[PDB]
């Protein structure tokens, strides 16, 4: 149906990122700011970007020049954000490829621990209750000592891991020869593409719900502990997860909406897609936390200490689940194929959009003087060389710093706040409503206007100031304290995109003649936003 063509309601942000962020922040208290942000700023900004693209019929950069020439740095900020995100979004795919290649033997490597990479502290999970120190689980030991080979800190990069580097090269070469060729989909594969992840998720959920101790996991996942709400990090993580999953503030939704017709009702579509995305994110937590509760019951420890409080939660939990099913290798192969399929489509779309946006800036020297293939190869090679920094023995710390500052946090709240503020208080909410009534056929209600003028601005500014007043530095797995220069580099990563609006404002102000007031009054006037008809 239209849902099959719509897709996007499933992604790695729903399967890999939401459960680990919910588990890190206690679980249950994460859901109040999550839903508050979802119904206060998530859907309205998505609809605003879609409608701006549809109205202007322009991409992510040229659309802001026809609405407010002064505030034209939002497109450059989005370009920088997407460029930073494309570097580290593919290490997850590299890990999935490594796991898939490792799951082709007669026995799964993480089922038992008697191998070369194990330690004397390891014991089988089913025999821990017989005896009881510092004992460890075979699956965690596998993930930490065979795939990662963790070092004592970020300042100990150790040596490059050649198998992970080759997997990264393989996934980047898959991205190439497909972005270049242009093969995206057909009229027969989309039925299997959009149905396989849901079938796998249903199988995993059914398996998890029947395990002993699942009720404790559900209670942990659903009970809203209140005293955790005084920490700004819960609010920031819950708010930025919605932005990350919806792929807003990246310049992609504007381009997607630019392909719609002028007379098309996208309001109902933006609501359906958002609701389905949120529901898909919410459902898989049940399976994840039922598995976690079963593991806690089996090992005789707390649910808050069984697994990693970081990005490896899925790679620790899901293989444990597939080890409890008949024919485990078949299910492992299916699960990791599904993960790769989920990741590759988003990576393809994002890299293609970034390349198109970068080419559009210089159409003369990137279409005639230089071919597009050379530019694509250069971008891919630079991204691979940059991402080589996260496949060493101390690359997990570098990955955690880019997933906290590069494409989330204060940098995603800055862009959203400036978009909403510009639209609400310069162009005009009533003017935008008149346009929307012209296109979609009927006038919307007052929810979108108030979310653009009051709710989104207050939430963004309030969360930012709260974090600075009660400051707490970033940690890894609750125990690693990063050095000061690492925090400085992480903040520079966000500032590199945050500093795009004032600089463009200064350039525009200096590139005009006349009095200051005259200059400001001229760069604030929209320039024929809808020219078609
Ligand atoms: C005003 C427009 C039309 C033309 C001028 C565009 C200029 C002002 C914009 C476009 C892209 C922007 C740059 C994008 C990336 C970086 C890298 C960061 O480390 C320093 C800021 C810096 C250097 C930005 C500063 C301003 C910038 C150069
Ligand atoms: C450290 C992050 C770097 C991210 C780089 C993204 C692209 C930056 C260049 C964008 C276009 C600049 C030229 C625009 C001239 C009008
Ligand atoms: C024992 C488990 C298997 C470990 C070996 C990993 C294989 C890595 C695959 C990538 C090799 C291809 C290089 C790039 C293609 C030209
Ligand atoms: C004693 C050796 C120090 C090891 C630190 C190296 C860590 C790598 C961090 C660099 C990441 C690049 C960010 C800026 C480029 C976009
Ligand atoms: C009438 C003058 C309005 C000028 C608004 C300037 C806002 C500058 C940024 C304020 C803080 C935004 C934080 C968003 C979340 C990081
Ligand atoms: Cl989500």
How are the SSEs placed, and which strands pair?
Layout: H1 2-6, H2 12-24, H3 31-56, H4 62-65, H5 73-88, H6 91-102, H7 128-131, H8 138-148, H9 162-175, H10 190-209, H11 214-222, H12 232-246, H13 252-258, H14 267-299, H15 313-322, H16 328-361, H17 372-387, H18 395-405, H19 410-440, H20 447-469, E1 475-476, E2 480-481, H21 484-498, H22 500-510, H23 516-523
Antiparallel strand pairs: 1-2
Bound molecules: cholesterol (CLR), hexadecane (R16) (4 copies) and chloride ion.
In words, what does this structure look like?
With 533 residues, this protein is mainly alpha-helical. The chain has a single domain, classed as Amino acid/polyamine transporter I. The chain has 23 helices and two strands. A two-stranded antiparallel sheet has the order 1-2. The longest helix is centred in the middle third of the chain and has 34 residues, at 328-361. The relative contact order is 0.18. Bound molecules: cholesterol, hexadecane (R16) (4 copies) and chloride ion (CL). One hexadecane is lined by residues 101-102, 163, 166-167, 169-170. Residues 94-161 are extracellular. Glycans are attached at residues 114, 130, 134.
């Amino acid at each position: 149906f239209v849902l099959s063509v719509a897709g996007g309601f499933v992604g790695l942000g729903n399967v890999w990122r939401f459960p680990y962020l919910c588990y890190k922040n206690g679980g249950g208290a994460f859901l109040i700011p999550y839903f508050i942000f979802l119904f206060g700023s998530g859907l309205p900004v998505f609809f605003l970007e879609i409608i701006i693209g549809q109205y202007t019929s322009e991409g992510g950069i040229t659309c802001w020049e026809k609405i407010c020439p002064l505030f034209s740095g939002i497109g450059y900020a989005s370009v920088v954000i997407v460029s930073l995100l494309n570097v580290y979004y593919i290490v997850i795919l590299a890990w999935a490829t490594y796991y898939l290649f490792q799951s082709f033997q007669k026995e799964l490597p993480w089922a038992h621990c008697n191998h070369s990479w194990n330690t004397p502290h390891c014991m089988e999970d089913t025999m821990r209750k017989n005896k009881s120190t510092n004992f460890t689980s075979p699956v965690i030991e596998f993930w930490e000592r065979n795939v990662l080979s963790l070092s004592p800190g970020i300042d100990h990069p150790g040596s490059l891991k050649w198998d992970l580097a080759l997997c990264l090269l393989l996934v980047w070469l898959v991205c190439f020869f497909c972005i270049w060729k242009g093969v995206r989909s057909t009229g027969k594969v989309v039925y299997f593409t959009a149905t396989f992840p849901f079938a796998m998720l249903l199988v995993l959920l059914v398996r998890g719900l029947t395990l002993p101790g699942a009720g404790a996991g559900i209670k942990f996942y659903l009970y809203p502990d209140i005293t955790r709400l005084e920490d700004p990090q819960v609010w920031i993580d819950a708010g930025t997860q919605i932005f990350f999953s919806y792929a807003i503030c990246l310049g992609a939704m504007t381009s997607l909406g630019s392909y719609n017709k002028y007379k098309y009702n996208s309001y109902r579509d933006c609501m359906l897609l958002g609701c389905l995305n949120s529901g898909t994110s919410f459902v898989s937590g049940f399976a994840i936390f039922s598995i976690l509760g079963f593991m806690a019951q089996e090992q005789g420890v707390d649910i808050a200490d069984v697994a990693e409080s970081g990005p490896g939660l899925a790679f620790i939990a899901y293989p444990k689940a597939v080890t409890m099913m008949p024919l485990p290798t078949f299910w492992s192969i299916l699960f990791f194929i599904m993960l790769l399929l989920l990741g590759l489509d988003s990576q393809f779309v994002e890299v293609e959009g970034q390349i198109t946006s970068l080419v559009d800036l210089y159409p003369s020297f990137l279409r005639k003087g230089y071919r597009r293939e050379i530019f694509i190869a250069f971008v891919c090679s630079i991204s691979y060389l940059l991402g080589l920094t996260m496949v060493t023995e101390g690359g997990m710390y570098v990955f955690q710093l880019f997933d906290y500052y590069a494409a989330s946090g204060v940098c995603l709240l800055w862009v959203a706040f400036f978009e909403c503020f510009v639209i609400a208080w310069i162009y005009g909410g009533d003017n935008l409503y008149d346009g929307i009534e012209d296109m979609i056929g009927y006038r919307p209600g007052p929810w979108m206007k108030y979310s653009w003028a009051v709710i989104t601005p207050v939430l963004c500014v309030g969360c930012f100031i709260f974090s600075l007043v009660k400051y707490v530095p970033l940690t890894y797995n609750k125990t690693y304290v990063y050095p000061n220069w690492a925090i400085g580099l992480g903040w520079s990563l966000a500032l590199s995109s945050m500093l795009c609006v004032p600089l463009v404002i200064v350039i525009r102000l200096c590139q005009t003649e006349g009095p200051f007031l005259v200059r400001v009054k001229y760069l604030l006037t929209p320039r024929e936003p809808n020219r078609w008809a």
